[PDB]
Write a protein that binds this ligand. Sequence first.
Ligand SMILES: CC(C)(COP(=O)(O)OP(=O)(O)OC[C@H]1O[C@@H](n2cnc3c(N)ncnc32)[C@H](O)[C@@H]1OP(=O)(O)O)[C@H](O)C(=O)NCCC(=O)NCCS
Ligand SMILES: CC(C)(COP(=O)(O)OP(=O)(O)OC[C@H]1O[C@@H](n2cnc3c(N)ncnc32)[C@H](O)[C@@H]1OP(=O)(O)O)[C@H](O)C(=O)NCCC(=O)NCCS
Lengths: 170, 170
Amino acid sequence: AKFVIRPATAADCSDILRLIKELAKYEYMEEQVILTEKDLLEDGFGEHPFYHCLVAEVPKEHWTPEGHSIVGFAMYYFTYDPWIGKLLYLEDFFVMSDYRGFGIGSEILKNLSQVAMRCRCSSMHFLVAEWNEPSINFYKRRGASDLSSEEGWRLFKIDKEYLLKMATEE
Amino acid sequence: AKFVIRPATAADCSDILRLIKELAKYEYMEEQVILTEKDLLEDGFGEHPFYHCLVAEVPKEHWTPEGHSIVGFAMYYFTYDPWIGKLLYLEDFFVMSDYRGFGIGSEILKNLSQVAMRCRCSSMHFLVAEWNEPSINFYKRRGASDLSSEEGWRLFKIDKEYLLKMATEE
Ligand SMILES: CC(C)(COP(=O)(O)OP(=O)(O)OC[C@H]1O[C@@H](n2cnc3c(N)ncnc32)[C@H](O)[C@@H]1OP(=O)(O)O)[C@H](O)C(=O)NCCC(=O)NCCS
Ligand SMILES: CC(C)(COP(=O)(O)OP(=O)(O)OC[C@H]1O[C@@H](n2cnc3c(N)ncnc32)[C@H](O)[C@@H]1OP(=O)(O)O)[C@H](O)C(=O)NCCC(=O)NCCS
């Protein structure tokens, strides 16, 4: 269960999509993943990357039965709030079950925190499902607070089909 | 009443800051504004910035009692979704009280939608306050859906002091 945490490089895109799907098919949303390798590659390693990713890599002897060395990841990016400051936004955080409990998640969180201090971020933001009490307590044990409930904020979206109408108006 | 919406310029910073403060008041967050004009110019237009702003100008006949032409604005940046990829995230959106109900907001959303199409964003995300009925309806009547209801998401935060604790722990 030896492993190291490191930034993902262009060569890692197949693995990231693999872990996204593995994450999805851990929540049975696997088919919902429209994202392709070309997208991960053009969106993360071009001139202006739209996301950043730290991955967990295991040695040859610990490869997955499928034969893969990356067994976990965290996807994130920086955002900004005029009344909070510059923020590190944690989008996805996942470690394959047969590799959990060996400190991988802990190391990722420590390095994301260090990256936050480097970037002079005032806070780390992320989403948690209201019913997922185990995940909620994990984060509260780390000092997190439910901003949506304490301050009365709801997350909204306007999907592509509506943005298209409005954009092509008249 | 022929208002115009367009990208902001460095010379717009003073109006942008003023509007951010009016929006903060509207949200009961005035005291927590940490943005200064310096920051806006720096972060907003300092070569490959952190965020993007749009402003809406009215003609002379309707300038503000204080003589301002910028009567509203939108602040946005891009985020990422592992399932569908690049998203457009709307951080702040505001229209001065005397200038609501005339179509100014609609046009800003129309401009944001075009930004979305060009940059190939699949959706636009943003937060709305619990009691902001006006915005909730404005958004919904334009295709928005409340993800906190539909998917149970809660925005969580871990501020700097706890990030420091996790960064220096191991
Ligand atoms: C929580 C998560 C990061 C744990 O990763 P990990 O590699 O197992 O982390 P570690 O091995 O460093 O141990 C982390 C901790 O989880 C606890 N843990 C015990 N069983 C666990 C399990 N089956 N799964 C996850 N964590 C477990 C460990 O005891 C340890 O204690 P602590 O949380 O009180 O500090 C996990 O990988 C995960 O992704 N969980 C949920 C998915 C997610 O991230 N959801 C986000 C919702 S906002
Ligand atoms: C909700 C708000 C932001 C919309 O901005 P706006 O400039 O009023 O937007 P518009 O004028 O384009 O649309 C206003 C509305 O009245 C209607 N309207 C606009 N122009 C109209 C016209 N010419 N004739 C008839 N109705 C009109 C629109 O249909 C819309 O109503 P709906 O929400 O029921 O669909 C509004 O300004 C407000 O109350 N803002 C408060 C501050 C706030 O909440 N800011 C966001 C913090 S995140």
